[PDB]
Design a protein around this ligand. Structure first.
Ligand SMILES: Nc1ccn([C@H]2C[C@H](O)[C@@H](COP(=O)(O)OP(=O)(O)OP(=O)(O)O)O2)c(=O)n1
Ligand SMILES: [Mg+2]
Ligand SMILES: [Mg+2]
Length: 428
DNA sequence: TAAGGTAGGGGAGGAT
DNA sequence: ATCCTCCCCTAC
């Protein structure tokens, strides 16, 4: 018990073993890799000439579901269908990694703090908190992916995440529903109690929206020609791929707070969109509202091997960072470079460009954040350098990293987050 | 207390 | 116009 501090040689090890966000990233990176290894010898790209159907498959409230099926006996009293359940580490300003649909019926969301969530529960409803079961999340993911390959349904299976895949059926020149039902059934069995939803369409965007609409353990079909106002009206603006908190806020400020995608599509003009959120994004939203994919989004189908090929490598620590002097910082940077170099050498690459980025306590922010050991409100400072020659040498890299830190001049006591990045990777 | 990581599109504004 | 650095955003 008692958390390993940031000045301890195995801080990274212990922090990563506990951080679900690090797991998410690590699992994602490994899956991309596995895809590249399994397809070294397989013609893989899809063309303009090709006709295809997208089946976007995702586990429902993934950690919550798995953590519940694997729960210790002191929680046997729990009922997934009637009780609000979440997976998290703590009791107050702790992230709810995943919450079940009963919890969502009260307004609880993934990403919300436990303290926030409990305020949303009416008298007589108690929040149930489950621990993370990382190894089990991984075993269910493996079953999911092997099961997909085993049915011999798809021409290609793109791993998006530990619980999500974009599967493609190429159609040469009703069945879809039977297929959706088979996949859901076999995955439910190959996984034991887990559930998966499916969005099926002729565009990646619609498949993703259909997925959201199908979500509570089901499937939804919807093609470009099935679009209706009832379909639009059912989505929040940030249900669009590529639209998060800021884009939402900008869309709202520009088009008189539209509440559903239908309201947005009835009010927008391409030009205003572009002025509001960027053009490409504006352009992406524009196409999405007509059920069409932007070119950027399509590269993953026309060339998965290049899209899935890792182009950078880094660590980003923003919790538990508390230092008193530059010596501790230097040692931390050194260890960070040692960790990254282990990774770099594992994927047989060198780097020609590095970046040190840091989070510094804002002038106006409290010295200790509302969140225990959190970074709190901070300002970003970043600096990069081109290395003369691609290298994997600790000496060159660590020395430049330490040098970049002096240039940004953040007093150690103000440091609250730190990122070490290898931006351009060169081969062999 | 509680584990706020990371890859990789993008755009602003200064350098060419 | 294009390219580069230092961010911001989103995704999961
Ligand atoms: N802010 C977040 C979002 C997600 N995740 C983890 C928890 C989830 O189980 C998993 C999957 O992301 P999803 O968006 O797919 O979350 P769910 O699968 O839990 O919800 P849904 O049923 O809406 O797909 O990754 C997390 O730790 N923190
Ligand atoms: Mg999911
Ligand atoms: Mg997912």
């Amino acid at each position: 018990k008692r958390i390993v501090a940031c000045d301890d040689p195995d801080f990274l090890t212990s922090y990563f073993a506990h951080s679900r966000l690090h797991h998410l990233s690590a699992w994602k990176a490994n899956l991309k890799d596995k895809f590249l290894n399994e397809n070294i010898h397989k013609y893989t790209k899809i063309t303009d000439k090709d006709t295809y159907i997208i089946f976007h498959i995702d586990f429902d409230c993934f950690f919550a579901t798995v953590a519940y099926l694997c729960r210790s006996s002191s929680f046997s009293a729990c009922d997934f269908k009637r009780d609000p359940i979440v997976v998290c580490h703590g009791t107050k300003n702790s992230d709810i990694a995943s919450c079940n649909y009963v919890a969502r019926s009260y307004g609880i969301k993934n990403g919300m703090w436990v303290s926030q969530a409990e305020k949303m529960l009416p008298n007589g409803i108690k929040l149930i908190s489950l621990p993370y079961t990382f190894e089990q999340f991984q075993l269910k993911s493996e079953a999911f992916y092997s099961t997909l390959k085993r049915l011999n349904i798809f021409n290609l299976i793109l791993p998006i995440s530990i619980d999500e895949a974009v599967c493609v059926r190429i159609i040469p020149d009703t069945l879809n529903a039977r297929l959706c039902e088979e996949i859901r059934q076999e995955i439910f069995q190959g996984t034991n109690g887990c559930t998966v939803s499916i969005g099926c369409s002729d565009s990646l965007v619609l498949a993703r929206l259909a997925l959201k609409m199908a979500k509570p353990n089901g499937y939804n079909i919807t093609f470009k020609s099935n679009l209706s106002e009832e379909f639009w009206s059912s989505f929040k603006l940030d249900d669009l791929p590529g639209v998060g908190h800021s884009t939402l806020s900008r869309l709202e400020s520009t088009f008189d707070s539209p509440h559903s995608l239908n309201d947005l599509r009835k009010r927008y003009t391409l030009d205003a969109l572009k002025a509001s959120v960027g053009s490409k994004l504006g352009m992406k939203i524009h196409l999405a509202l007509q059920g069409q994919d932007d070119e950027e989004s399509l590269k993953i189908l026309y060339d998965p091997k290049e899209v899935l090929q890792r182009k950078s490598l880094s660590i980003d620590i923003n919790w538990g960072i508390r230092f008193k002097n530059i010596t501790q910082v230097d040692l931390f940077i050194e260890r960070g470079c040692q960790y990254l170099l282990e990774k770099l050498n594992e994927i047989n690459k060198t780097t020609s460009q590095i970046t040190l980025k840091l989070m510094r306590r804002c002038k106006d922010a409290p010295i200790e954040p509302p969140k225990y050991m959190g970074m709190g409100r901070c300002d970003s400072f970043s600096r990069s350098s081109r290395l003369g020659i691609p290298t994997n040498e600790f000496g060159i890299i660590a020395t430049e990293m330490k040098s970049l830190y002096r240039t940004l001049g953040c007093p150690p006591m103000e440091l609250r987050g730190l990122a070490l990045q290898f931006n351009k990777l060169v081969d062999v």
